[PDB]
Ligand binder design. Sequence first.
Ligand SMILES: N[C@H](C(=O)O)[C@H](OCc1ccccc1)C(=O)O
Ligand code: NA
Ligand code: NA
Length: 418
Amino acid sequence: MGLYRKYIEYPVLQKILIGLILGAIVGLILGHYGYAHAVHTYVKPFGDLFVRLLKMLVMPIVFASLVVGAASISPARLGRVGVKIVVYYLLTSAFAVTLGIIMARLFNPGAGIHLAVGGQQFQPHQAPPLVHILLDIVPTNPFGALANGQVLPTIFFAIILGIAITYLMNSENEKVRKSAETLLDAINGLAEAMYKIVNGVMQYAPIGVFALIAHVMAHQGVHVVGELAKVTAAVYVGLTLQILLVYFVLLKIYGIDPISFIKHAKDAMLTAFVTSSSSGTLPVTMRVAKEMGISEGIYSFTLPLGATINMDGTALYQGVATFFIANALGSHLTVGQQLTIVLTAVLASIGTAGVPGAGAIMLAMVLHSVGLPLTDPNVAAAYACILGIDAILDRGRTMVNVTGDLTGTAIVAKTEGT
Ligand SMILES: N[C@H](C(=O)O)[C@H](OCc1ccccc1)C(=O)O
Ligand code: NA
Ligand code: NA
């Protein structure tokens, strides 16, 4: 029990990074001496178990999180300040995904990698016309969409259902109000239960990543050190442009001096880089906002909300990650699929999920909507590759997420003062 206990409190992301390094080394050593059949027969089934567990948790989270999230920012309860801050959060998230897509075009990640896990390349599906893509957002049967794997139709039904519940809770009838509260509590309980299961699965992630990487390297000796460096460079350069080309421009437009803003907010960014948690730095963010002179009534509402639904760093990462996987498999993304990435990433941020390791679940949502199933051996291999280096990228993502929260509060405060 002592050895098992020591395995738990070790950070999950660092454990996943360790599994990636040893998996590559073990696969190369075994493959040089043969033993490719042994790795395929025995090591591979452990990796297949991990992806099956990860895919099982996707659909219940999609429905439950969006229903609860949409109820919190429903128009029935949003004030004048709430409306303005919500618009800013959604617009900035939309441009973050687009910026990440552009960076993936300049630096091609995984272009040199050619993945044939089973001996055959990935076969993409046919692209429907653009007009049909827009219409299929509305599901003809909400139960059928849940039974199947339509992510976007499920999101559409969950959002409108959550908004309608909030209007029922303002009704004059006592019975109607009680029925609405009971339904919301049951759906909220389902979301909380899913997060507990996510914590357990992520503890098995280092074992699953080790098996997937070892199987790939044993069969073929692909070089990934250079390619994983390019995806790291694309993410960090994109994060820098997000601050300079968006936050600095918006502050200049609204009259806030960008130089003074950075000096006051430097404490929040450093804490975000070290702790690598948005909720952990919330007390520090509140103190920084008070120093700038923002009224207590404003930042006491915007800052707690921003830590949940405003994530510019995560949105940019999802754009780069999707192109890396598609390039590695040799497929191409059409304009209809690229717009699906932007629409899915922005809408999924509304869902209330703060459990660590939820970034992997979010990436699986985007891949499934585009048309890259996680059960495919080629997709799973590429997915485990970029998941291994998640420890390095996490520090940069958290800093941008916190910085965007402070920028929105300052802009809203200036408008209220006028
Ligand atoms: N760590 C980041 C943060 O807390 O701001 C960020 O948060 C985790 C998260 C939670 C839910 C959905 C997406 C991402 C991440 O790691 O991707
Ligand atoms: Na945003
Ligand atoms: Na944030």
